[PDB]
Amino acid sequence: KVFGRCELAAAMKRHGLDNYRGYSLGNWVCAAKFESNFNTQATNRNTDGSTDYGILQINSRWWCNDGRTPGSRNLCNIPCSALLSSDITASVNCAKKIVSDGNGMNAWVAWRNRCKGTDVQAWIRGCRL
Ligand SMILES: [Cl-]
Ligand SMILES: [Cl-]
């Protein structure tokens, strides 16, 4: 599923990301924009053999099981395939564990490089929330 901007802001709010660990909804929508262009089916292979899955490009190195990332963990206790669903529940629940890990949203390199310190409220401007 490719979400609309406001559609994904609404879904992320409904699933409790709105100011989760102090990160406003715009930060989350901005991260999703640059990680997946709002596409729940986005996948990208990493140089180390791990794969990033879904709207927030969650890495099999630590967070999900895909059966092909040697020496990896599955700290969200989900198959990586769950992160590709039209239903964002698994991606949101896993993102809450990631952002709670100590480095906040810096876990998403694209958030650090493209969202951090920008006017992220632009991402939810005009949205019925
Ligand atoms: Cl957009
Ligand atoms: Cl594990």
Ligand code: NA
């Ligand atoms: Na894994």
